[PDB]
Amino acid sequence: MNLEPYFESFINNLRRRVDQLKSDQSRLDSELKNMQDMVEDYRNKYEDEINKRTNAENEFVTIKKDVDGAYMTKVDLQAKLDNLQQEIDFLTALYQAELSQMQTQIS
């Protein structure tokens, strides 16, 4: 008979396709592992950075509390100054009037 040689030809073409598919596989294994390494990197950058942002949130809250308090004081004190000065002006003109009155008073 004489069937094989053509069988052999076709099998060789086949073994070609399988060889390519194995090489492809390996490559995709590597690219996958590399993408996983990257995924874990990005995940860590994320987690780490939400810890960073949250501790910054807290630092902010504290400084803002200090500011709020200090505005409270400043307006309190400024108001008390306004009181003292206004009282000064008043008392000056008054005391001038006190001397004026005592003086022109029947002894």
């Binding site: 399988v18 993408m35 902010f60 400084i63 400043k74 003292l84």
Partner: protein, 102 residues
């Protein structure tokens, strides 16, 4: 025999199918991996940009706290000079009364 050549060919067909599907599965694992990444990336970008914004607003708060304590101190000193001016006016009047008793 003829039949044996057949048998190999069939084994090898099945291998191609197993390897083709296996590769496809891996690829899909890759695409989904890329996507998961992109999610974690955008999420991180926004977390960072936030942290930055809050820290800069903090810079603002520092500036206003500094100037604010400066103004506080200034006012305090002026309260001292004014409480003084008050007391001195009190004494002036007292001496006027010392004239009354004369």
């Amino acid at each position: 025999d003829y039949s044996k050549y057949y048998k190999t060919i069939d084994d090898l067909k099945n291998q191609i199918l197993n390897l083709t599907t296996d590769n496809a599965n891996i690829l899909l694992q890759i695409d989904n991996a890329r996507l998961a990444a992109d999610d974690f990336r955008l999420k991180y970008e926004n977390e960072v940009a936030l942290r930055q914004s809050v820290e800069a607003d903090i810079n603002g708060l520092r500036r206003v706290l500094d100037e604010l304590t400066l103004t506080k101190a200034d006012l305090e000193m002026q309260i001292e000079s004014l409480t003084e001016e008050l007391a001195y006016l009190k004494k002036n009047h007292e001496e006027e009364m010392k004239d009354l008793r004369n």
